[PDB]
Structure formats: structure tokens, C-alpha cells
Amino acid sequence: GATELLEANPQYVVLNPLEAKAKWRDLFGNDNPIHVEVGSGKGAFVSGMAKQNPDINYIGIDIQKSVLSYALDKVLEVGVPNIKLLWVDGSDLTDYFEDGEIDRLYLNFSDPWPKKRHEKRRLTYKTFLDTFKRILPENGEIHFKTDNRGLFEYSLVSFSQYGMKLNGVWLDLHASDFEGNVMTEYEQKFSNKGQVIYRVEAEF
Template identity: 65%
Template sequence: MRLRNKPWAREKLDAHPQYVVLNPEQEKGQWNKTFNNDQPIHIEVGTGKGQFVTGMARQNPHINYIGVELYESVIVTALDRLIEADLPNLKLLNVDGAELMNYFEKGEVDRVYLNFSDPWPKTRHAKRRLTYKSFLSLYESLMPDGGEVHFKTDNQGLFEYSLKSFSEYGMLLTFVSLDLHNSGFEGNVMTEYEEKFSAKGQRIYRSEAKFQPRP
């Protein structure tokens, strides 16, 4: 993905602390106070321009959502969506998803969404895939027993790799679709990429995997 430089993005993000959590390490262990409720927390790692996480927050007001995105020039568009929607159950984090352990305590996150992540197709880059075992360990460290990872992609190779990765890690696959839009699945909220790829007739793959209690 080629990113357009937006030198004004940082200033805009800093100007909206009611939507963008500027010092998330200070919220670790007390996100219920940040949202002022005890609702479950679901996070999207790599939230991009925010269409998915905004749609989910609007559809499910009983759940708190956090969109995590590294690039300022991308998450600023998600901020525009949130400003327009003004959803009290959605916050944005402009941080690296590989460092989530700095911002959440064990058990604070109930679900992680991974949508159209970079496939990193070369074998030597496997460790960068967001469904690689080290990332699964990271997500597990944030969740209670039974926490879930929900994954969508248009990339068949990445999907096959991810199913294998989930299984080898000991996760329970509770949902697998090789053609989401023709599966009868209800309540799907599309990302920007999903709209683009499905409009071209490409399949969308989706899975849900649950962490199991450790012996």
C-alpha cells in the first residue's frame, strides 16, 4: 500500500483526544474507566481508514471497540469517520500492533479482528504476518480464556497459512468460510478493501478461532 504523506495528520490526531487515545500506556488496566463502562472490548489490528471498526461500533453499541493503526496518514481518515459518527464506544490508537502488551492487561480484550492484513507472501517474511505464532501469543496475552480472533482476507495463501497457524497454536476453529459473501453469514460489516475486491468478483475468506485454556 502506497501511503500519501499528510504532514498535518499528527496535529489533527492530537487535537481530538476524545477520540484518539494519545497516551494509551496510561490506560493499561483501566480501559473500563476510559470508556466509563464495563462492556467487552474488541480491537481491530490494522484498522486502516476505519470503515469496519466504525460500522461495528455503530452496529453493536453494547461493545467497546478500539481501532489500532500505525500510520498517521491512514488513521486520520478513520478519525474523520469517527468525528462524523460520534460513537461513544469507539476509540483509536495510533500505535504499532506488535506492542499491544504495553497498552492492555491480561483479560482486557475479548476479541481481536484482523482484516485484509498484509500477506507477506515470501517465506522469509512469515514472522511479519499478523497470524504468525508470535502474534497469536501476543493476542492471547491480552485475553481471558476463550478469547477470539476473527480474520478476513482475499488472499487464499494467507488464509490457508492462517488456518494452519491457528490449529498448530492449539486454537479451536469455530467458523470457516471459503466464500463469505455467498455463505449466508449475517451481520457482516465490510472493510474498504472488502468492498473493492468483492466488487471484482474475488472471494472473501473468513475464519473465527478461539484460544483454549492452558493445562
């Protein structure tokens, strides 16, 4: 009963856009910046980020209620106020956020959709970029990390062709002096493998 667990926990989980869009600051109860992760899996990333950064409000977003319920288990345990989980029903994120309502966007290990005919499904494809540009402020940024070389190669070109500026590029994240990295479950699971992790900060 994924849907059941989510519904019993409205202090953390948002289920319908009507009670979200333009209302996120009211929902958190302060004007702290709102940073969103799209495709938040089982919540290790948003949880670890909320802990590192008490004065930032995080929203973990997933299309699947099942996996969001696992994120909830993690979020309930931590018990900190600067997180919320959002179930999205398939619509554009503009149904859930007003233009400029969020401050930064995170994409972690997003589905690569390697087949050419599935380009449109990649979260770094231009129609998703249109949506992200709207919901972020002017000069708003996407911070994107993945171990998928093909996806990262594609996304650098997609970002650039769209007209975004690349502010930083990491081609071996774990080997760099980058600090504050919070690993996803996937990232943990495979840390022992030691394959390079790619990262970029891109700006609209």
C-alpha cells in the same frame, strides 16, 4: 498534519500506552465488552461495527498516524461514543492492554507478507498469537477475514499448529448465510470483482 489532528481529538484517539493499559474501561466509561481490530485502515470496519453494536466498545488500532487520521475523519462524522482509535508505536500490544483486558480480536485483510523470510511479519504468526492470547480472556477468539488465499491457508495452519481450535470456517463469505458482516474499504473497493472472501473464528 496527521499527528496534529489526532492530538486535537483525545475524546477519540489514544496516543500513549501509559494512558491506555489497564485503563480502557475507565476511558469508555462502562464495563461493556471491548473488541479490538488490529490494522484498522480508514475506519469503515470499526465505525460500521460500533453502529451495528451500540453495547460493544470498539478500538481501531493502527501503526500509521496518517491512516489513523482518515479513520478519525470517519469517526468524527459518525459521532458515537463506543469507538476509540489507538496509535501503536511498534511495540507488542501487551504495552497497550493488560492480560485479559479485551474480549475479542478482529483481523481484516492483514498484510499477507507472502515471501517465506517475511513469515514473522504476518499478524497470524505465532509470536503475535502469543500476544493476542495474553490480552484476550481464556477461550478468547480471533475473527479473521481476507481475500488473500495464501495468507488464509497459512493462517489456518498457524492457528491450528499453535493449539487454537477452529470454531467456524467460511470459504465463500458473501455466498454464505452469515449475517452482520461489515465491509472494510478494501472489501468495498473490490466487492464488484466478486472474488471469494475467506473467514475463520479461532479460539485460544
